[PDB]
């Protein structure tokens, strides 16, 4: 344990060593006693681990060949019903990624007063930018009208309904006067986390994944499928991180987790399930090979139950998973 | 993709007025853009921002990919002098928190006000890159068995480092006020001063004496693991600087009324002060010479790069010094 002479930096500000961070004073929220700019010592090892795992998942949409997809798309082989599924899913995802990434930067990051958790957030937000690039790349490859696809959430009622709900559940977190140092403020902040991690990423996105990955399984639009596989790998970590963050904030601030807040979260999850079912019905008015809307009634309920359990809430639907392969 | 558009390949609107929200390319602006929907990436207007984003994405690296065995062997040996160790430690000290300062300013100050989705795409890449740089300094500390708390706290313990970061805080301005807005001449000028403080001064000047000293070791075959990590950080920082210059010049072009003789002078004076603090930091790092490095060389170098930064944002060079380190403009193959 011996090191050469001169391997330490000498301080010349004599009071400065007091600013070294005490690991145990670190908190996920409302932490202003210690220096948020120093990463070390890392307290939340789960956050750092998610960061490292995310970094190991580097990919770019432009690495994925689209030749076979373009050839299929331009042919007469796809039914109009199949094209409808693809188009509605591209319309929803094209802007939803932006909504998620903007909320991380503009709502979440300020109030997560912890450097290792913020490291992960920076990785997550970049990953949402990659997902956006994906949708641009798909549109350009297939020769879709990119404005028509990206504007879908303003033109298609079942998509608009999901993102209008998302706006509601975002709450007042963007307001200049919003703070998390009240019980009510921190409850609102947690509802925003549930809205984006549990509902948007954890329910809305997983349902679109099934539709697209169902094509991939049939050897149709395999390039889009492969991109969605990479997106799913990322979203798995986004969800695990968000659940950890929610559970961590609960643990450190047990006064927020009232029966009232719990019921409010349950009610928002129910509303999200109903919207996602409506969206699946809009995607599948008749149903295509391997996919019918009735399967989504079961699937959306099933995943909602899994998300509820992860944040300490009772399952409510008790439906089986009709897509075991997911 | 040049084949016929097939029947049924359009998605039908069931909200008839919704088409009005498709974004007109000519309505997009870098700041104060409330006329169009910021959540839609397309159509891309600022091709330069998108190019920076694609270039950054092509530069993926991780500090953990760079072997540290030879550096550990050298650090543990008597073949590195006390003065050489001081250069390494002060630079690690400064960089370890500077990356977090830059990244936090991107997210908390810049992103809100850059009202354009392609520029925001680049910002998210840049902020992630700053996290990679932070990881790099943790990895170096752990690799060499340095006291991580000592290194990351350097900016509170060393006067020449604190002086730089205190200046940085000042030049951040009032942009963090949650009621700060860029929708006035004064507001937009303050925002542009923040961009100058972070892109031109922090990233474009304060990082450079450090890059020279560390890359000088790498050229001598000393601490080549740290050197390689600094080469990757340099490649990133070059793109960060180019983007910030492009953004400052684009904001000026779109809002020429902000670029007054008074603002121009204020910017020059900020850059002059940054030069003085950076020269003082180089003197702190180098009380005595090491091979190919002396504190006095940094007077010329820091002034030379400050002139180059000034020119790029349309201001006249003021120092006219030559570059003592012309190898720094040598294409590195990574
Ligand atoms: Fe996500
Ligand atoms: Fe940078
Ligand atoms: Mn995503
Ligand atoms: Mn950096």
PDB file of N, CA, C and O and ligand atoms in Angstrom, chain A residues 93 96-98 100-101 124 127-132 135 201 205 209 231-232 234-235 238, ligand 3:
ATOM      1  N   UNK A  93     -44.516   6.688 -32.101  1.00  0.00           N
ATOM      2  CA  UNK A  93     -43.168   6.615 -31.517  1.00  0.00           C
ATOM      3  C   UNK A  93     -42.335   7.836 -31.953  1.00  0.00           C
ATOM      4  O   UNK A  93     -41.484   8.289 -31.180  1.00  0.00           O
ATOM      5  N   UNK A  96     -43.090  10.494 -29.478  1.00  0.00           N
ATOM      6  CA  UNK A  96     -43.099  10.061 -28.070  1.00  0.00           C
ATOM      7  C   UNK A  96     -41.694  10.015 -27.471  1.00  0.00           C
ATOM      8  O   UNK A  96     -41.524  10.328 -26.289  1.00  0.00           O
ATOM      9  N   UNK A  97     -40.693   9.628 -28.264  1.00  0.00           N
ATOM     10  CA  UNK A  97     -39.312   9.590 -27.812  1.00  0.00           C
ATOM     11  C   UNK A  97     -38.866  10.996 -27.380  1.00  0.00           C
ATOM     12  O   UNK A  97     -38.254  11.157 -26.322  1.00  0.00           O
ATOM     13  N   UNK A  98     -39.226  11.994 -28.188  1.00  0.00           N
ATOM     14  CA  UNK A  98     -38.948  13.404 -27.905  1.00  0.00           C
ATOM     15  C   UNK A  98     -39.618  13.865 -26.614  1.00  0.00           C
ATOM     16  O   UNK A  98     -39.012  14.579 -25.813  1.00  0.00           O
ATOM     17  N   UNK A 100     -40.376  12.017 -24.072  1.00  0.00           N
ATOM     18  CA  UNK A 100     -39.680  11.405 -22.937  1.00  0.00           C
ATOM     19  C   UNK A 100     -38.352  12.109 -22.644  1.00  0.00           C
ATOM     20  O   UNK A 100     -38.041  12.432 -21.494  1.00  0.00           O
ATOM     21  N   UNK A 101     -37.577  12.354 -23.701  1.00  0.00           N
ATOM     22  CA  UNK A 101     -36.240  12.941 -23.554  1.00  0.00           C
ATOM     23  C   UNK A 101     -36.360  14.384 -23.036  1.00  0.00           C
ATOM     24  O   UNK A 101     -35.628  14.773 -22.116  1.00  0.00           O
ATOM     25  N   UNK A 124     -29.722   8.174 -20.496  1.00  0.00           N
ATOM     26  CA  UNK A 124     -31.077   7.905 -20.928  1.00  0.00           C
ATOM     27  C   UNK A 124     -31.568   8.903 -21.976  1.00  0.00           C
ATOM     28  O   UNK A 124     -32.157   8.534 -22.981  1.00  0.00           O
ATOM     29  N   UNK A 127     -30.080   8.279 -25.230  1.00  0.00           N
ATOM     30  CA  UNK A 127     -30.713   7.115 -25.851  1.00  0.00           C
ATOM     31  C   UNK A 127     -32.049   7.479 -26.504  1.00  0.00           C
ATOM     32  O   UNK A 127     -32.372   6.996 -27.588  1.00  0.00           O
ATOM     33  N   UNK A 128     -32.824   8.381 -25.876  1.00  0.00           N
ATOM     34  CA  UNK A 128     -34.053   8.837 -26.511  1.00  0.00           C
ATOM     35  C   UNK A 128     -33.776   9.579 -27.826  1.00  0.00           C
ATOM     36  O   UNK A 128     -34.531   9.406 -28.775  1.00  0.00           O
ATOM     37  N   UNK A 129     -32.696  10.355 -27.887  1.00  0.00           N
ATOM     38  CA  UNK A 129     -32.266  10.994 -29.149  1.00  0.00           C
ATOM     39  C   UNK A 129     -31.956   9.919 -30.224  1.00  0.00           C
ATOM     40  O   UNK A 129     -32.308  10.088 -31.381  1.00  0.00           O
ATOM     41  N   UNK A 130     -31.314   8.826 -29.813  1.00  0.00           N
ATOM     42  CA  UNK A 130     -31.035   7.722 -30.764  1.00  0.00           C
ATOM     43  C   UNK A 130     -32.341   7.139 -31.286  1.00  0.00           C
ATOM     44  O   UNK A 130     -32.475   6.862 -32.479  1.00  0.00           O
ATOM     45  N   UNK A 131     -33.302   6.935 -30.384  1.00  0.00           N
ATOM     46  CA  UNK A 131     -34.595   6.421 -30.781  1.00  0.00           C
ATOM     47  C   UNK A 131     -35.293   7.370 -31.756  1.00  0.00           C
ATOM     48  O   UNK A 131     -35.854   6.922 -32.731  1.00  0.00           O
ATOM     49  N   UNK A 132     -35.228   8.684 -31.497  1.00  0.00           N
ATOM     50  CA  UNK A 132     -35.770   9.630 -32.469  1.00  0.00           C
ATOM     51  C   UNK A 132     -35.106   9.499 -33.854  1.00  0.00           C
ATOM     52  O   UNK A 132     -35.817   9.441 -34.878  1.00  0.00           O
ATOM     53  N   UNK A 135     -36.545   6.776 -35.974  1.00  0.00           N
ATOM     54  CA  UNK A 135     -37.771   7.029 -36.682  1.00  0.00           C
ATOM     55  C   UNK A 135     -37.567   7.876 -37.914  1.00  0.00           C
ATOM     56  O   UNK A 135     -38.186   7.604 -38.932  1.00  0.00           O
ATOM     57  N   UNK A 201     -43.184   4.732 -20.937  1.00  0.00           N
ATOM     58  CA  UNK A 201     -42.131   3.760 -21.283  1.00  0.00           C
ATOM     59  C   UNK A 201     -42.571   2.341 -20.965  1.00  0.00           C
ATOM     60  O   UNK A 201     -42.358   1.423 -21.759  1.00  0.00           O
ATOM     61  N   UNK A 205     -45.186   2.088 -24.619  1.00  0.00           N
ATOM     62  CA  UNK A 205     -44.110   1.599 -25.517  1.00  0.00           C
ATOM     63  C   UNK A 205     -44.103   0.071 -25.700  1.00  0.00           C
ATOM     64  O   UNK A 205     -44.015  -0.418 -26.837  1.00  0.00           O
ATOM     65  N   UNK A 209     -44.240  -2.300 -29.092  1.00  0.00           N
ATOM     66  CA  UNK A 209     -43.163  -3.248 -29.343  1.00  0.00           C
ATOM     67  C   UNK A 209     -43.740  -4.557 -29.859  1.00  0.00           C
ATOM     68  O   UNK A 209     -43.227  -5.126 -30.810  1.00  0.00           O
ATOM     69  N   UNK A 231     -34.196  -0.866 -29.323  1.00  0.00           N
ATOM     70  CA  UNK A 231     -34.968   0.094 -28.504  1.00  0.00           C
ATOM     71  C   UNK A 231     -35.490  -0.591 -27.242  1.00  0.00           C
ATOM     72  O   UNK A 231     -35.342  -0.081 -26.126  1.00  0.00           O
ATOM     73  N   UNK A 232     -36.019  -1.799 -27.416  1.00  0.00           N
ATOM     74  CA  UNK A 232     -36.468  -2.587 -26.260  1.00  0.00           C
ATOM     75  C   UNK A 232     -35.384  -2.863 -25.212  1.00  0.00           C
ATOM     76  O   UNK A 232     -35.633  -2.777 -24.022  1.00  0.00           O
ATOM     77  N   UNK A 234     -32.809  -0.963 -24.557  1.00  0.00           N
ATOM     78  CA  UNK A 234     -32.645   0.290 -23.841  1.00  0.00           C
ATOM     79  C   UNK A 234     -33.814   0.508 -22.877  1.00  0.00           C
ATOM     80  O   UNK A 234     -33.609   0.864 -21.710  1.00  0.00           O
ATOM     81  N   UNK A 235     -35.029   0.310 -23.365  1.00  0.00           N
ATOM     82  CA  UNK A 235     -36.236   0.651 -22.561  1.00  0.00           C
ATOM     83  C   UNK A 235     -36.354  -0.246 -21.338  1.00  0.00           C
ATOM     84  O   UNK A 235     -36.888   0.158 -20.310  1.00  0.00           O
ATOM     85  N   UNK A 238     -34.314   1.650 -18.888  1.00  0.00           N
ATOM     86  CA  UNK A 238     -35.008   2.909 -18.549  1.00  0.00           C
ATOM     87  C   UNK A 238     -36.067   2.603 -17.482  1.00  0.00           C
ATOM     88  O   UNK A 238     -36.134   3.260 -16.445  1.00  0.00           O
TER      89      UNK A 238
HETATM   90 MN1  LIG C   3     -37.196   5.523 -26.089  1.00  0.00          MN
END
